[PDB]
Enzyme design. Structure first.
Site, PDB file in Angstrom:
ATOM      1  N   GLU A  29     -33.333 -29.944 -11.700  1.00 27.75           N
ATOM      2  CA  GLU A  29     -33.169 -31.109 -11.975  1.00 27.75           C
ATOM      3  C   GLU A  29     -31.832 -31.065 -12.580  1.00 27.75           C
ATOM      4  OE1 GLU A  29     -34.857 -31.854 -15.369  1.00 27.75           O
ATOM      5  OE2 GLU A  29     -36.640 -30.540 -15.311  1.00 27.75           O
ATOM      6  N   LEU A  30     -31.188 -32.376 -12.821  1.00 28.47           N
ATOM      7  CA  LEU A  30     -29.743 -32.488 -13.660  1.00 28.47           C
ATOM      8  C   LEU A  30     -30.427 -32.354 -15.142  1.00 28.47           C
ATOM      9  N   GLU A  35     -24.921 -27.831 -23.633  1.00 25.96           N
ATOM     10  CA  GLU A  35     -25.422 -26.831 -24.290  1.00 25.96           C
ATOM     11  C   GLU A  35     -25.781 -27.485 -25.688  1.00 25.96           C
ATOM     12  OE1 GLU A  35     -22.868 -23.554 -24.776  1.00 25.96           O
ATOM     13  OE2 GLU A  35     -22.234 -23.322 -22.749  1.00 25.96           O
ATOM     14  N   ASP A  68     -32.851 -13.423 -21.017  1.00 28.46           N
ATOM     15  CA  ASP A  68     -31.648 -14.079 -21.330  1.00 28.46           C
ATOM     16  C   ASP A  68     -31.633 -15.289 -22.244  1.00 28.46           C
ATOM     17  OD1 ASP A  68     -28.942 -13.681 -20.968  1.00 28.46           O
ATOM     18  OD2 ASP A  68     -28.759 -14.719 -19.097  1.00 28.46           O
ATOM     19  N   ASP A  90     -31.237 -21.209 -16.401  1.00 29.12           N
ATOM     20  CA  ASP A  90     -30.780 -19.902 -16.255  1.00 29.12           C
ATOM     21  C   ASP A  90     -31.597 -18.641 -16.027  1.00 29.12           C
ATOM     22  OD1 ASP A  90     -29.471 -17.641 -15.691  1.00 29.12           O
ATOM     23  OD2 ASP A  90     -27.559 -18.014 -16.851  1.00 29.12           O
TER      24      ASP A  90
END
Lengths: 194, 264
Positions: A29-30, A35, A68, A90
């Site tokens: 998804e967009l 950030e 991460d 991510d």
């Protein structure tokens, strides 16, 4: 990427459905907002934090460790919304978690686990409250050393007025023994967060 | 992979049992077309993934994968693989000379030179595996074999690839991650150092009266050249001392071991 690795990521992604984690349609998804940290440059630290904790709780529910978690892997769905939302992204490093002749490293082998995620959260929490990074060094070698010694301070330039509860929450996360670290359930029951 | 789904009995005649394992049985077999002789190892599959008994598919596939790669005179070779409801059958080179240690125990003690000849063979095999980035992970004396007992210069075969593996920001990372040391080739080197010790004497360096004492001894690297067994050259002990090192990064590598003056 060694496809074992590609395969691993897709498998995790398929598994997971939560509001605070990114969603995969077909092989993402967009997430427009960027950030999260940029978009901020205690009560409201806590509001964002609760969301991260919620996602990680769900992940750990599935026995998945992200491995991460950092500020660039935390994103906002839309910057321009009244109560904005975060998505963890991510998932490249994510994993499901489970003598005469043998070497010490084997005899003494201890696997990584969900604890590492919690430490990370403590690092992120520190940053959130200050613009500062707890273990950061002039050189990487310096930084690695700091992380192993758990060499950090709450400096006055940043922390003199920070609440005791906030520090407790971070002090509880930033522990060298993984066993003694606060779990995700524990963190959500913590007083600063309640 | 897809392994041969034909019936093995169809192609080989099984003989006697040479070995056993928690999940495995090995038998002599002779190949009908060839008349050649092999070892057939039967590995029992897990009935379900959730099943405690048996060996997993991922595990079986790994060993197969790896054996397929290996082509060395000191390492055991795979001929074919067959599959069925309960087992997976390996077809293996028959290594029939027994454990090297059993052979050695049936003869007058070796000179250091004689012993070094055998070790050199072990090193040579490990060098090949390590060059392929494979860690055996299980080199103990019972996995050191003789192809033939009765030849003048007997050939060792490294066997048993069940545990073998191919061996493939910082701000935010936990100490366990910072200090993470993966398991690798260094473990085999440790093993070579244990085998070399037992080869020169008849004693296991870390074995205590209880499994507890043994494990502690290993973690402490608590051993000695007890002079009843070793009063052996300075160079041979130097060799062992450079392998029985607790920090894997300080251990001699296979390349350094081959170059060590006791070896070279």
């Amino acid at each position: 990427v060694s496809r074992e690795d590609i395969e691993r990521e897709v498998s995790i992604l398929k598994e997971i459905q939560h509001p605070n984690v990114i969603t995969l349609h077909e092989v993402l998804e967009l997430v427009a907002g960027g950030e999260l940290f940029d978009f901020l440059a205690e009560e409201e630290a806590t509001e964002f934090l609760k969301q991260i904790l919620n996602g990680v709780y769900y992940l750990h529910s599935l026995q998945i460790a992200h491995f991460d978690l950092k500020p660039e892997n935390i994103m906002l769905l839309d910057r321009n919304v009244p109560k904005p939302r975060i998505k963890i992204i991510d998932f490249g490093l994510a994993h499901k978690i489970d003598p005469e002749f043998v070497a010490p490293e084997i005899v003494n082998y201890e696997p990584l686990g969900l604890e590492a995620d919690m430490w990370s959260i403590g690092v992120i929490t520190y940053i959130l409250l200050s613009g500062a990074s707890p273990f950061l060094g002039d050189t990487k070698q310096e930084t690695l050393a700091n992380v192993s010694a758990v060499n950090y301070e709450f400096e006055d330039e940043y922390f003199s007025n920070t609440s005791a509860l906030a520090k407790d929450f971070i002090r509880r996360l930033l522990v060298k023994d993984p066993k003694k670290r606060m779990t995700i359930q524990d963190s959500l029951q913590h007083p600063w967060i309640k």
